[PDB]
Every structure is written in C-alpha cells, then in structure tokens.
Amino acid sequence: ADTIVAVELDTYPNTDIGDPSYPHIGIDIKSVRSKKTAKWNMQNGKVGTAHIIYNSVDKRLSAVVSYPNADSATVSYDVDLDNVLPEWVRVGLSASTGLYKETNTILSWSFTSKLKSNSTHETNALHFMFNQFSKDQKDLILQGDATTGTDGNLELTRVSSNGSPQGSSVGRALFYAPVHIWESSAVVASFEATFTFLIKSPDSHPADGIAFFISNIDSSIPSGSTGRLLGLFPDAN
Amino acid sequence: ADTIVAVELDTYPNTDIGDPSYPHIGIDIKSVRSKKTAKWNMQNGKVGTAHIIYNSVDKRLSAVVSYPNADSATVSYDVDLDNVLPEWVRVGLSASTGLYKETNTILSWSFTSKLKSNSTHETNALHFMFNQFSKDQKDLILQGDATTGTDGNLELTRVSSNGSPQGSSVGRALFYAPVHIWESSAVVASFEATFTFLIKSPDSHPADGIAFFISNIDSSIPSGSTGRLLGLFPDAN
Numbered sequence: 001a002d003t004i005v006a007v008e009l010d011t012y013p014n015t016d017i018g019d020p021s022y023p024h025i026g027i028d029i030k031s032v033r034s035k036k037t038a039k040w041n042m043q044n045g046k047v048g049t050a051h052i053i054y055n056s057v058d059k060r061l062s063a064v065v066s067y068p069n070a071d072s073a074t075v076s077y078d079v080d081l082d083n084v085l086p087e088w089v090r091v092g093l094s095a096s097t098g099l100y101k102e103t104n105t106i107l108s109w110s111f112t113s114k115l116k117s118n119s120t121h122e123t124n125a126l127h128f129m130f131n132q133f134s135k136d137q138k139d140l141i142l143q144g145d146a147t148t149g150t151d152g153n154l155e156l157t158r159v160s161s162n163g164s165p166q167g168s169s170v171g172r173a174l175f176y177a178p179v180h181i182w183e184s185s186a187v188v189a190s191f192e193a194t195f196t197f198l199i200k201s202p203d204s205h206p207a208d209g210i211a212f213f214i215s216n217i218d219s220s221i222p223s224g225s226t227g228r229l230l231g232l233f234p235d236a237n
Numbered sequence: 238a239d240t241i242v243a244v245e246l247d248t249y250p251n252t253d254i255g256d257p258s259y260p261h262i263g264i265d266i267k268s269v270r271s272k273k274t275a276k277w278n279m280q281n282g283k284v285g286t287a288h289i290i291y292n293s294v295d296k297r298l299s300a301v302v303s304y305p306n307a308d309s310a311t312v313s314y315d316v317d318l319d320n321v322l323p324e325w326v327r328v329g330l331s332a333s334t335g336l337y338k339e340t341n342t343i344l345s346w347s348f349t350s351k352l353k354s355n356s357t358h359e360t361n362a363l364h365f366m367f368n369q370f371s372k373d374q375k376d377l378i379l380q381g382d383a384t385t386g387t388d389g390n391l392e393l394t395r396v397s398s399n400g401s402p403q404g405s406s407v408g409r410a411l412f413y414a415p416v417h418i419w420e421s422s423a424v425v426a427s428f429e430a431t432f433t434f435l436i437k438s439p440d441s442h443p444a445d446g447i448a449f450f451i452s453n454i455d456s457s458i459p460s461g462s463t464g465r466l467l468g469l470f471p472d473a474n
C-alpha cells in the first residue's frame with residue numbers, strides 16, 4: 001500500500017475505529033486511527049482555515065484550524081518524519097462522503113518546503129500558492145471525483161449543478177512536482193501548508209472530512225476508501 | 238516543432254547565422270537568430286550570474302549577466318509573451334558543445350512566477366530554488382547528456398571524470414511542474430529566473446553556450462541541435 005502522513009479534519013465520528021464522539025482534527029501516521037486528536041467546533045457553511053507546520057529541529061507535526069471570531073482547535077504529535085516517509089513525496093488534499101455528505105470545497109491552498117544544508121551551505125525550497133483554481137489546472141493531479149474551475153474553486157467530492165453534495169464520493173488533488181521532504185545532510189528541513197475550506201451539509205449531518213496528506217510519489221485512491229477512510233487508507237487498521 | 242523563448246549566453250560566434258564576432262547575450266523568440274544581442278566579456282572559468290525578468294505590464298524580457306568586480310552585460314526586447322507562448326509551459330536550462338567545447342556547469346537555479354488576478358483580487362505563484370543538485374533530483378526532467386550529483390552541481394553537457402568537456406554534446410534540465418505563464422484574466426503576470434554557472438574551456442576556445450528557456454510542456458531536444466543550436470532549435474531559421 002501507499003505510505004501516508006495526514007492531518008484530518010474529521011466531520012463524522014466513527015466510534016468503531018477510534019474516532020472520539022465529536023468532530024475532531026487529528027494527526028494520522030500510516031493509519032486512519034489518529035495518533036492524536038483535538039475537539040473541533042466545526043461551523044456548517046462558514047469558511048475555515050487549516051495551518052499545518054513541521055520542522056526537523058522539534059520533530060513535531062502541528063495543525064491549527066480556525067474560523068473568524070471563534071477559538072482555534074490545535075493538535076501536535078512528536079514524530080520524526082525521516083523514519084516514516086520516503087525522501088521524495090507528493091503533497092495533496094483528500095476528501096470523502098459516505099451515507100452522509102458535505103461540500104469539500106477548497107478556496108485556496110499554499111505549501112512551502114525548505115532543506116537548509118551547512119556542508120554545502122545553501123537552501124533548496126519549493127513554494128506554491130493557489131488562490132484561484134482554473135478548469136484545466138496542469139500543475140495538479142486530480143484523482144477520483146475532484147474537479148477545478150467551478151467559481152475558481154477545487155471541489156474534492158462530487159457536487160450537483162444546484163450545489164448539493166453527493167454521497168459515496170472520494171477525490172484528491174496532488175501538486176504535480178515531487179517534494180524533497182527530508183535529507184539526512186540538511187541541518188533544518190521544514191514545511192508548512194495552509195488551505196481555506198467551505199464544508200456545507202444541507203441535512204446538517206456532515207460527513208466525512210478533508211485531509212492534507214503526504215504520500216509516496218505514485219500514491220492513488222485505495223480501493224474502498226470512500227466514507228470513514230477519507231480517500232487515504234485501504235482499511236481501518 | 239516546439240515553441241521556444243530563450244535567453245542565450247552564446248560563447249561561440251556563428252557569424253553565418255547572424256551571431257556577432259564576439260561572445261554575446263541574446264533574446265531568442267522562436268529562432269536561434271536573436272532578436273536582440275549585447276556584447277558579453279565572458280570570463281573563462283569564473284562563476285557568473287544570470288538574472289532574467291519579465292512582466293506583462295512592460296511586456297519587456299530583460300537579462301543581466303555579471304561576474305564579481307566586472308561590468309554587467311544587459312539585453313532587453315519588447316515582446317508580448319501571451320502572443321508567443323502557450324498558457325502552460327515548462328521552464329528549463331539547456332546547453333551544447335560542437336566542434337569546440339566547455340563545461341556547462343550550473344551551481345544554482347531559482348525561478349518565481351506569479352499571476353495576480355482581479356477576479357479574487359488574489360494571486361497564484363510558483364517558486365523553486367536549487368542551491369544543491371542531488372544524484373536523483375525527482376523535481377527535474379533531465380534530457381540528453383544532462384546529469385546531477387557531481388559536487389552538488391547540474392552538468393548540462395558531458396564531462397569526463399577529471400573535468401574534460403566533450404564535444405557534440407547537448408543536455409537540458411526542466412522543472413517537473415508545468416507553469417501557468419500567462420492568463421488573460423490576470424492584471425499582472427511576471428517571472429524571474431536566476432542561475433549561477435561555471436563555463437570552462439581548457440583549449441581556451443569555448444563553445445557553444447547556456448540558455449534559460451520556456452517551452453511547450455512536452456518539449457524535447459530537437460534532433461541534431463548540438464553545437465550552434467544550443468539544444469533549443471531543429472535548424473538555424
């Protein structure tokens with residue numbers, strides 16, 4: 001299977017696979033069963049912001065999710081991503097729906113990776129910023145149901161023309177270029193990701209969520225990963 | 238055939254296809270016969286810097302090549318790149334040798350592209366920076382004789398184990414991700430590229446040069462484009 005590290009915005013509690021009994025943000029290392037979670041006071045139909053940060057000095061992956069004029073949710077986990085990920089990865093967003101559904105709409109996405117060396121004292125860097133997605137976005141790999149260019153947005157899961165989200169949907173968008181995420185001859189390796197999202201459930205019973213993830217370059221949507229597995233994992237182990 | 242826009246650092250005077258008598262920097266729009274040139278006091282075996290700039294406000298492509306403690310060479314040409322290039326491109330470096338030869342060593346390369354909309358009043362951007370090239374650089378496409386890893390450098394043309402450049406060589410390195418170089422909904426499109434290079438000829442007779450180029454995404458080395466064609470053009474038209 002793929003190797004996945006992900007930050008989940010999990011809108012539906014699957015208590016049979018370790019979810020707490022409330023919408024939560026979580027850090028996922030090679031399993032949908034989050035190594036750490038925090039309660040998330042998710043706001044139906046309002047624009048949210050997710051910030052993800054990692055640096056190789058602290059070896060700590062953290063995420064903050066916020067809405068205007070509300071308290072943040074934050075979650076952190078100590079992990080050395082050198083022991084978890086391959087040296088080269090792709091970065092992406094994933095979302096899914098099941099019996100229950102929501103818009104998984106991305107309004108903007110930015111990413112920065114840096115390797116600062118000293119032996120050869122100069123830095124390698126990648127930065128991308130999408131504030132507008134177009135109909136034929138050739139620096140994105142769209143998988144499953146993901147589409148671009150509807151009001152300049154990335155729709156990770158299927159939405160009908162009148163704006164109704166579909167059930168049993170899964171879709172992902174990966175940046176085209178592979179990312180050099182760690183190198184054992186750097187003194188500082190770091191990345192940050194920001195996205196703004198609009199999650200709207202008409203039934204106000206939302207599912208299943210959005211994740212930022214980092215994978216092996218050749219990662220694809222695993223068979224049967226709709227619903228609780230967020231288009232990231234083949235099973236619930 | 239490919240669509241090419243390029244800034245050439247042309248070390249060899251091919252006076253039959255309109256080169257001047259001396260090493261020159263040139264702006265190439267769909268032909269090796271530069272639309273504009275400037276004299277370049279090229280220094281055998283010293284590290285140089287090239288800076289390339291364009292914005293859609295001035296519609297002016299400019300370049301400056303410099304060494305420590307020396308007068309720059311600069312060249313500009315008015316051109317509307319949205320009348321020349323496709324919307325989506327790749328960016329790269331190219332070099333060649335012919336009967337005469339030189340090391341075509343790249344020590345660093347950075348690129349920034351930005352599209353500023355009025356729709357969102359918000360911006361799409363790509364930035365990469367390589368200060369070190371690794372043996373397996375998965376965010377580069379290498380074509381022809383180009384290799385990475387030797388002392389952390391990119392060698393666009395063939396060099397022997399002791400640093401002797403081979404003749405009749407051609408090689409290119411393209412950034413993996415397509416770039417969105419223009420869009421008619423943007424109010425400003427701009428790019429900049431910077432690279433440092435070490436061009437060394439033991440015979441003290443250098444050829445043929447190095448170019449920064451922008452092409453169609455599926456561009457490859459034209460057949461027979463060693464020597465004066467700099468790996469960019471199928472002919473001297």
Ligand SMILES: O=C(NCCO[C@H]1O[C@H](CO)[C@@H](O)[C@H](O)[C@@H]1O)c1ccc(-c2cc(-c3ccc(C(=O)NCCO[C@H]4O[C@H](CO)[C@@H](O)[C@H](O)[C@@H]4O)cc3)cc(-c3ccc(C(=O)NCCO[C@H]4O[C@H](CO)[C@@H](O)[C@H](O)[C@@H]4O)cc3)c2)cc1
Pocket residue numbers: 249250251252253255256257258259334335336337338444445463464465466
């Ligand atoms: O326009 C000029 N102007 C003057 C000189 O240029 C300078 O001058 C000033 C000071 O010097 C300075 O102020 C300026 O900077 C200025 O630019 C000019 C025009 C042409 C040439 C030139 C011509 C030729 C050439 C050779 C042979 C023919 C030929 O015989 N054609 C066939 C016959 O055609 C005619 O007759 C038939 C039959 O009747 C008819 O059908 C036809 O229609 C015709 O009428 C034509 C022209 C050649 C050169 C030249 C060639 C080669 C080199 C050179 O250095 N080669 C090295 C080897 O190349 C390989 O290695 C290189 C290095 O690695 C690579 O780059 C290559 O790719 C190869 O691999 C140099 C010059 C010039 C000159 C000036």
Ligand SMILES: [Ca+2]
Pocket residue numbers: 010011012013014019208228
């Ligand atoms: Ca869940």
Ligand SMILES: [Ca+2]
Pocket residue numbers: 247248249250251256445465
């Ligand atoms: Ca030439």
Ligand SMILES: [Mn+2]
Pocket residue numbers: 008010019024026032034
């Ligand atoms: Mn969960």
Ligand SMILES: [Mn+2]
Pocket residue numbers: 245247256257261263269271
């Ligand atoms: Mn020239």
